[PDB]
Design a protein around this ligand. Structure first.
Ligand SMILES: Cc1cc2c(cc1F)OC[C@@H](NS(=O)(=O)c1cc(C(=O)N3CC(C)(C#N)C3)c(C)[nH]1)C2
Ligand SMILES: [Ca+2]
Length: 129
């Protein structure tokens, strides 16, 4: 069940979508539909500093895929990206776990700081002390 996560993307801020967007550019490198599949994911995952398997890879894509087409778009990446950094995507299953912050370091790099969570800065018509 993904009701809270799927909604998380909505809570995100304009800066968030962009911060993560730049990552998809590299994450979907070569992809025909700019989506992340077993091929693309396998490339990045390996570059992150690990050595996953082709069978497990597909499990991740579908594990995050909302429709289950076989790949992940820019939106399907945010839904998981939220829980990825929160480390609450699985809870307590297996040691296997991808780092959201560490991932960006591969795609874009160190171009993701507090600014990423601009949502906290100010995205409404109000102010407090
Ligand atoms: C398309 C997409 C999906 C996911 C991505 C990043 C993406 F690009 O990252 C998070 C992933 N969910 S997960 O539960 O962390 C997770 C990690 C793994 C895995 O194969 N391994 C971790 C490993 C490298 C080790 N040790 C082996 C599995 C099976 N689930 C789902
Ligand atoms: Ca899909």
């Amino acid at each position: 069940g993904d009701d809270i996560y799927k909604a998380a993307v909505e809570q995100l801020t304009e800066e968030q979508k962009n911060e993560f967007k730049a990552a998809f550019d590299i994450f979907v490198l070569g992809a025909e539909d700019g989506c992340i599949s077993t091929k693309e994911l396998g490339k990045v995952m390996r570059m992150l500093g690990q050595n996953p398997t082709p069978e497990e890879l597909q499990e991740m894509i579908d594990e995050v895929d909302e429709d289950g087409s076989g790949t992940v778009d820019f939106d399907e990446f945010l839904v998981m990206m939220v829980r990825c950094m929160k480390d609450d995507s699985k809870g307590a299953g297996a040691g296997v776990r991808i780092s959201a912050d560490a991932m960006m370091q591969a795609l874009l790099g160190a171009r993701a700081k507090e600014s990423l969570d601009l949502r906290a800065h100010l995205k409404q018509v109000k102010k407090e002390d």
